[PDB]
Design a binder for this molecule. Structure first.
Ligand SMILES: CCC(C)(c1ccc(O)cc1)c1ccc(O)cc1
Ligand SMILES: CCC(C)(c1ccc(O)cc1)c1ccc(O)cc1
Lengths: 224, 224
């Protein structure tokens, strides 16, 4: 099929482990600390992954940073959503960190994780493919609506290249549904809605100062 | 062109007036009271308008209400965005209520109105047409991601009918850009993001109890 899709598939990063501290008693602080630690390490991986998206590394460093600072939460959330598609009412943050409803309650994340579960449910019904997941991640980066872009036409070209990839993929692989590309694009509002609420929630956790957070996660949170 | 588009055009409601009280001194309370009063009357008009969307009135009354309760803020915001396309740095809430940056500051809405202005700016660059505006309003209603839908397949059919209308319209009217329909769909995340923040902001105004609000606006706010 489409070459951009095949390229994004081979550029997909390896999974990483959450490694919750086995000496620490389970608590809301432990869960939130584990999750923000995992996110910090995933952000390093996301920055490296974006260099593989066609045209991304030719943007100015400022525009690269603006896109990543706008899109990082959507990219992280799309990841856990995809990892969770074969599960029922559980979120696979990592192979060693799967959250059920009780754990979400304990961490203070019941409402936020339930919105992520709504995303999972919709993609399950659509039978979201890995090809579509990696293309949507890249589209979410290009379409992230930063207010600080220098070269707007170059970012629009990036959007166009990835959108065309999705169009072409669906036209060749899903002829039974001539609206599947658009259906995939119409899942992005709920992703943006959930990411908006997640950023607000974890910014409040940052302000409360009870959960330690690493440098990169704080930089992305403070920018966003 | 497409019949659904032509139908939505003739079903477009007439504009209504804000009618700020000329005896009341200008204040943040006056501005917010005027705006929520306008929104309350527009919500009545939106409920009547939705009956014209093909298939909408055949949904259960519960599903009709669920869609409207999820989508109402996006529909209102898309309206002011469209009315503002011929203006510069001003938001045309009504012909008699146009907000510039200073008035937004006075009302406590500078950040929220600036996000609405970001939507305006993007649609200006895309040269958003009335045909596209009315189709996107209907798509926003069908795609509003309510958690309480009874007949999910019927709501998906509604999404499909309106999405096909946009597809067909762009294929016939905008052959120069084979990705214009998708570009239009990719403006919906920023609309959802801005509406999410607006709902939070006006719910806080509701809780502070200093701005009087009418019955329907309160019902939509409390549901959403
Ligand atoms: C703030 C990001 C964070 C910790 C996260 C971490 C790793 C990951 O792969 C996806 C998301 C998160 C966001 C929302 C939420 O409900 C729970 C956790
Ligand atoms: C809460 C709805 C409200 C009052 C509104 C009213 C009429 C209308 O056509 C569109 C929106 C609004 C929302 C966000 C905002 O920044 C300013 C005002």
């Amino acid at each position: 099929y489409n070459k951009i899709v095949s390229h994004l598939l081979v550029a997909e990063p390896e999974k990483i482990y959450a490694m919750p501290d086995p000496t620490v008693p389970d608590s809301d602080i432990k869960a939130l600390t584990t999750l923000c630690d995992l996110a910090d390490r995933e952000l390093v991986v996301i920055i490296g992954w974006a260099k593989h998206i066609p045209g991304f590394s030719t943007l100015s460093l400022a525009d690269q940073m603006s896109l990543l600072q706008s899109a990082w939460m959507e990219i992280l959330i799309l990841g856990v959503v995809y990892r969770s598609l074969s599960f029922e009412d559980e979120l696979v943050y990592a192979d060693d960190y799967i959250m059920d409803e009780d754990q979400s309650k304990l961490a203070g994340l019941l409402d936020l994780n339930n919105a992520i579960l709504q995303l999972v449910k919709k993609y399950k019904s659509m039978k979201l493919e890995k090809e579509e997941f990696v293309t949507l991640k890249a589209i979410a980066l290009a379409n992230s609506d930063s207010m600080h872009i220098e070269d707007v036409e170059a970012v629009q070209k990036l959007q166009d290249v990835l959108h065309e990839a999705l169009q072409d993929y669906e036209a060749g692989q899903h002829m039974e549904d001539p609206r599947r590309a658009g259906k995939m694009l119409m899942t992005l509002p709920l992703l943006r809605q959930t990411s908006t609420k997640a950023v607000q929630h974890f910014y409040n956790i940052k302000l409360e100062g009870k959960v330690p957070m690493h440098k990169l996660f704080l930089e992305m949170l403070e920018a966003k």
